[PDB]
Amino acid sequence: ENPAKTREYCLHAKLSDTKVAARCPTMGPATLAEEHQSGTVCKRDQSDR
Amino acid sequence: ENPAKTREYCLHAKLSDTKVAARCPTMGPATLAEEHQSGTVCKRDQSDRGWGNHCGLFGKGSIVTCVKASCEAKKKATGHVYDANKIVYTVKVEPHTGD
Amino acid sequence: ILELDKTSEHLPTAWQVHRDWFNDLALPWKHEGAQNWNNAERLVEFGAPHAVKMDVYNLGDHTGVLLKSLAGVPVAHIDGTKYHLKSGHVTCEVGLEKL
Amino acid sequence: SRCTHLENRDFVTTRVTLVLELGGCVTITAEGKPSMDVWLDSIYQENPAKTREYCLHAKLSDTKVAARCPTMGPATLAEEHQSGTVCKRDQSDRGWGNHCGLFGKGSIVTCVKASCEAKKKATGHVYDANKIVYTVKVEPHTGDYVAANETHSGRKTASFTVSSEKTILTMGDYGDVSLLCRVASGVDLAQTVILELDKTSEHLPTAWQVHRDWFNDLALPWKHEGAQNWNNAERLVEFGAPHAVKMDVYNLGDHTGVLLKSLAGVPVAHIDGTKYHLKSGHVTCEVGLEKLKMKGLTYTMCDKTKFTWKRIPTDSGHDTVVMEVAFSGTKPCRIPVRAVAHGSPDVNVAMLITPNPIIENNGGGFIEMQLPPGDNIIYVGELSHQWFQKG
Amino acid sequence: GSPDVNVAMLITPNPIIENNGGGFIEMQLPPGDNIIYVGELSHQWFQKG
Amino acid sequence: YVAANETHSGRKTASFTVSSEKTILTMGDYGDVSLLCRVASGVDLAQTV
Amino acid sequence: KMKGLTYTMCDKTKFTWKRIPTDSGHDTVVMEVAFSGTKPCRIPVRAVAH
Ligand SMILES: *[C@@H]1O[C@H](CO)[C@@H](O)[C@H](O)[C@H]1NC(C)=O
Ligand SMILES: *[C@@H]1O[C@H](CO)[C@@H](O)[C@H](O)[C@H]1NC(C)=O
């Protein structure tokens, strides 16, 4: 009767509120407040400017 | 004049808001909202638990601790970098007179 | 140009330091206008877990660690906004033919 | 049982010799005597004797410079004699335009009054084998369970020192136990300094158990207790290269982090006001069970039908099973506890670490036992529980 | 010598006072100088050898 | 400086009998000092009249 | 405990010999100075080998 739940997995993500920030070739790292929040995925990358 | 600030370093941390959460050996990971806030340091580890450790089972329980960590006032080492398009060399000349 | 507290009465205003070595300083760091320190872990130790404790320890002021690694290093003067090298050189041609 | 609270434990079978350690516990057992949990609770001293103070951050003030032209002999200051000054004597390239009459190496001297900055001291203390106290604790291994943050009302304490003597503790109803701990067989205290910093630092250890020679070997400015000036104050001051009639004095900054970085692989030590505690150390101690008594051997067995589990049989993580039962009456009772293998169909194999388990009004429900490997059934009257034992 | 170790090897073991009794004590001691104590009573003792 | 016929204020006196242990003398502003003189290892009284 | 480690140095100009440096008969030198200020002080004593 009612065995204990271990890990849940997610099969299909729901994505909302995309944001972008960028900087010029010597202004160091671009940043967003959403890098320091729960429930966000972020990527940091380099772009030819 | 005013060469570009590069990376600042912090020489002395100001540590605050040490928060702990822990769980019994079956219940998986302990958690804090700190772990996701800005300006925190955290560690996750395993702590021995048992009966009387106010816990059901003898084993290792997940523990997480997080400390809020700003820089101490005026304890910064700032770097600056020169620009070949704004640097000035100064050359001086004097006539080798009898003065 | 490495710069600490400009108001330090018993230190150089700055030091002329190598770019790779500066990027190898083992401390928490951030860029100009960034709000919070990268690698804040570097100034915090966690004491081995005890039941529902893990011990947050501030690893102290690293200023003297830096100054030992800056012993004998070339100074740089800072005349307000002007950041001056105190070692280095330039190549010139001097025209004597109209003296 | 306090010895269930620790993952370091041992078991021993009328007098017995033990080694008792900080961060260790022994469940003593004997035929027809109640078992006892015994540990070294603390090693400490009230206000141990100071050794050397060190300064971690110098304070420099009243800088003075004097210089002399290339042949007028050595420059001098009265401050080169005075106590609590750091000085450097050097040569300066002088000439005309520095307003000498001549070109060559002048003499320059610079001196500064060099104290130590407020609370920036590392202080050593050392233990005395004739004033150090070893606290040993004992509790009767009754059928009562208390948390780590609870206290067996039967928990009893003995303090050992070179002047202390073979001590008898009355274990309440469980008779009495005789204890003789040889403090001279314990820690080699001469090899240790209790290194201390600012005690008030919220995010640091109160002290460190450093080696004796290492504390004498530190390259810092230093003094013995109550002296008003610092030996070797050069160790926090650099002097610049001289320029004409000037030389710069550089304060080498706070060495607190330099020391803390070097305190790697070093055991912490605890300070409780005036009490300075070690957190590693041990004593050879001799225990006697001759006057211990089992409670309630005259009681009836409790009614086998009237038990319930309060804590189902659970592995302690030692080789022992632990459990707690609740009985519906309030009767003083023996508990009918047994265990039988899935093998020999009726032979009892419950090797109790809690011998002669008994219930009393508001006590006695807890039991600890060792078992043989493979499947068993544990029984506590009409309570039963199958048990696979590891092997 | 040893500044606090008790060396009073009592021939009268567990000495006790009672109303109108118990004041007498006999002991063996190690050779050389000692101090005997009976509370705040003290007495230096050179033992023969 | 006081002459041999003159008393120094901080002169402090301890009278070692056989009934005597480590004795504390308060040296005014100079703190405390303590003495234990071992009277049975002084003069050989049995040989002396 | 040392008395007076905390006191200021006395004014170097205000000393006079009351008993000039004298050989004690032991290996030591003894002397006594009179100081004309009223102050509690440390004495700025030193000696220099040629
Ligand atoms: C012991 O600690 C536990 C921690 O969960 C707490 O629930 C319990 O009330 C404590 N007992 C007492 C009275 O200190
Ligand atoms: C000691 O003798 C001297 C003379 O030699 C005398 O002047 C002095 O009063 C005597 N007593 C004291 C207390 O100095």
Residue numbers in the entry:
A (entry chain B): 51 to 99
B (entry chain C): 51 to 149
C (entry chain C): 199 to 297
D (entry chain A): 1 to 13, 19 to 396
E (entry chain A): 348 to 396
F (entry chain B): 150 to 198
G (entry chain B): 298 to 347
From the reporting publication:
Tick-borne encephalitis virus (Orthoflavivirus encephalitidis, TBEV) is an enveloped single-stranded (+)RNA virus belonging to the Orthoflavivirus genus. Orthoflavivirus particles have icosahedral symmetry with a diameter of about 50 nm and a genome of about 11 kb. The glycoprotein shell of the mature infectious virion consists of 180 copies of each of membrane-anchored E (496 amino acid residues) and M proteins (75 amino acid residues). Envelope proteins E orchestrate the early stages of viral infection, virus entry into the cell and receptor-mediated endocytosis.
